[PDB]
Amino acid sequence: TDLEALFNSVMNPKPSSWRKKILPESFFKEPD
Amino acid sequence: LNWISMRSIASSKLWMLEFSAFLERQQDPDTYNKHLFVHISQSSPSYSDPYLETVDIRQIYDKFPEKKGGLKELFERGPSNAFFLVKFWADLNTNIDDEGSAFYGVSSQYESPENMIITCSTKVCSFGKQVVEKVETEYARYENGHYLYRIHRSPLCEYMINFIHKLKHLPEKYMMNSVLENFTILQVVTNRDTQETLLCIAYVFEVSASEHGAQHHIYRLV
């Protein structure tokens, strides 16, 4: 009886999205 | 201490020598396994070394606590040179938790010019809001013209191990990073007697693309 999870996604607003923020390029490029 | 605070995690008063989160199991009387989820070991910076890349603090307010007692409040108030943001590419590849229970804990080392008592508050944050908060008080030792402190083998709380468990038991890595998008930790180190903020590090995560090893990047908040 945990079909409720199907709802979280339409119900429950999305987060701020990291990639759209103003940051240095290196932030998403993992290093070697 | 100020030539380092542009290149390492350090304010004018405190500098973090090492940071480590790990899982350990003693396979044998003489053999042991230690796996490090994340590790930092910058204890010998040089003036030649390049400055860290700055990050606008306002950008990161969302993923960390807000309102009263939060980051804006702190940064606004505390010494500016003490705020750092770190991104970790964790290495989750380990088996030490299959059978025979392991040990999970974290450790760190700090250095100070001045002798003090430092209070370390660590908060884990889901979708910005706070879930768990641990506090530890560490005391100094004189060594080499300066003072030394440490968090040694601190036991990771149950919530933490569980989180790793679910995370590690996952099919694809992107499903991992996705979950990691909304999980962050904020650690604040304060001078107990005077209440000044000596170090504030904000941690954000991603899982390593590479089969083996972990990585990190450090930025100085502004």
Side-chain angles (χ1 to χ4, degrees), chain A residues 1-10 13 15-24 26-32, chain B residues 1-7 9-27 29-62 64-65 69-97 100-128 130-133 135 137 139-157 159-165 167-171 173-210 212-222:
Chain A
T1 94
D2 224 293
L3 280 136
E4 155 95 13
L6 280 165
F7 298 95
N8 290 103
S9 205
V10 314
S16 312
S17 182
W18 282 98
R19 213 113 172 39
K20 234 150 197 247
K21 270 158 194 154
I22 282 133
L23 317 205
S26 40
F27 189 103
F28 307 94
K29 165 112 170 134
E30 174 180 358
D32 302 289
Chain B
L1 231 282
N2 286 291
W3 58 276
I4 305 209
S5 68
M6 298 292 287
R7 314 144 152 96
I9 304 186
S11 37
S12 308
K13 304 199 170 209
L14 194 78
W15 172 34
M16 157 170 287
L17 304 183
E18 183 178 2
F19 182 79
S20 133
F22 63 80
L23 134 89
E24 177 169 358
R25 191 216 155 225
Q26 171 96 357
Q27 141 173 337
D30 285 22
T31 310
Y32 77 83
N33 310 96
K34 213 221 209 195
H35 181 252
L36 304 186
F37 297 137
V38 308
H39 181 66
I40 304 183
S41 180
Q42 23 126 59
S43 35
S44 242
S46 143
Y47 200 76
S48 38
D49 294 359
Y51 278 24
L52 297 185
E53 299 170 56
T54 70
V55 154
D56 196 32
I57 222 229
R58 317 186 272 208
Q59 295 287 315
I60 66 140
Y61 280 163
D62 336 13
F64 301 98
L71 208 49
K72 181 180 215 265
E73 196 144 75
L74 253 30
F75 172 107
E76 296 265 49
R77 163 179 105 57
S80 178
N81 67 12
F83 296 81
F84 294 80
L85 155 72
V86 179
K87 214 235 193 112
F88 270 129
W89 276 280
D91 178 310
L92 286 158
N93 200 10
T94 185
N95 188 129
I96 324 157
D97 62 288
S101 263
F103 175 80
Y104 296 75
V106 54
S107 309
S108 30
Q109 291 164 25
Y110 312 95
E111 178 170 317
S112 204
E114 264 177 329
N115 176 1
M116 352 184 258
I117 277 135
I118 78 198
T119 297
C120 179
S121 151
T122 316
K123 322 161 138 212
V124 187
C125 302
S126 220
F127 295 99
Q130 167 187 327
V131 174
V132 222
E133 165 149 280
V135 177
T137 285
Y139 305 89
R141 186 172 281 164
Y142 183 79
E143 184 131 316
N144 210 54
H146 51 58
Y147 297 87
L148 291 172
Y149 322 69
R150 103 307 213 227
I151 264 116
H152 183 256
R153 295 238 331 172
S154 181
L156 233 63
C157 294
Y159 167 103
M160 265 318 275
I161 312 163
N162 275 345
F163 184 63
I164 277 180
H165 261 359
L167 197 357
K168 236 228 342 93
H169 303 351
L170 249 68
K173 245 135 179 247
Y174 78 100
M175 323 177 31
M176 262 150 54
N177 302 13
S178 285
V179 174
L180 284 184
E181 229 180 345
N182 289 337
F183 160 111
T184 78
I185 320 204
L186 181 53
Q187 125 185 150
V188 182
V189 193
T190 349
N191 182 325
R192 165 200 106 169
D193 289 340
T194 81
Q195 285 283 338
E196 134 148 85
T197 299
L198 320 151
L199 270 208
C200 184
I201 316 187
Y203 302 93
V204 325
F205 309 83
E206 231 180 75
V207 139
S208 213
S210 199
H212 273 335
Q215 312 271 333
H216 55 86
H217 225 117
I218 312 186
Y219 305 95
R220 207 207 321 151
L221 305 180
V222 288

